[PDB]
Amino acid sequence: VRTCLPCGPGGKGRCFGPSICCGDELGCFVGTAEALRCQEENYLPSPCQSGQKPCGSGGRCAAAGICCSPDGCHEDPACD
Amino acid sequence: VRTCLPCGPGGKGRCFGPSICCGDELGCFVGTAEALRCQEENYLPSPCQSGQKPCGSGGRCAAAGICCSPDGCHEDPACD
């Protein structure tokens, strides 16, 4: 299954929602100029392949220590 | 107390913890380089002086429909 559309600086960040773009060496962008490209996952009633590590109540690990879900994001060492 | 420190893009942002920088018209930065000035909330009294409705669980309205909190920001329409 296809990965969740790239985003942010150098496309080195994958999407995690309508306004959440994150990367290992980037962090989680919630509702910002970077979360631009991720404004396309709307016209995609998915669930789409991401592949990182199932954490939290739905939010897969997005960036260094961030259980970053498609609705909001928080800190979770569970990601390391 | 001490109004939370300015951060990111033209300082038009504010610190919501040491890893989170959000702004109404900017969005919410979390774990990204733009929080390059918030870690300094560690060496300052906490909680700092914010100035928004206490959305979410002890969280804070930081952006557009976003309840940006020191541990995480989640989409919260209560913040419009």
Swiss-Prot record, chains A, B:
Disulfide bond positions: C4-C48, C7-C21, C15-C38, C22-C28, C55-C67, C61-C79, C68-C73
Transmembrane parts of this sequence: none
Domain of life: Eukaryota
Protein name stated in the entry: Neurophysin 1
Portion held of the full protein: 38 to 117 of 125
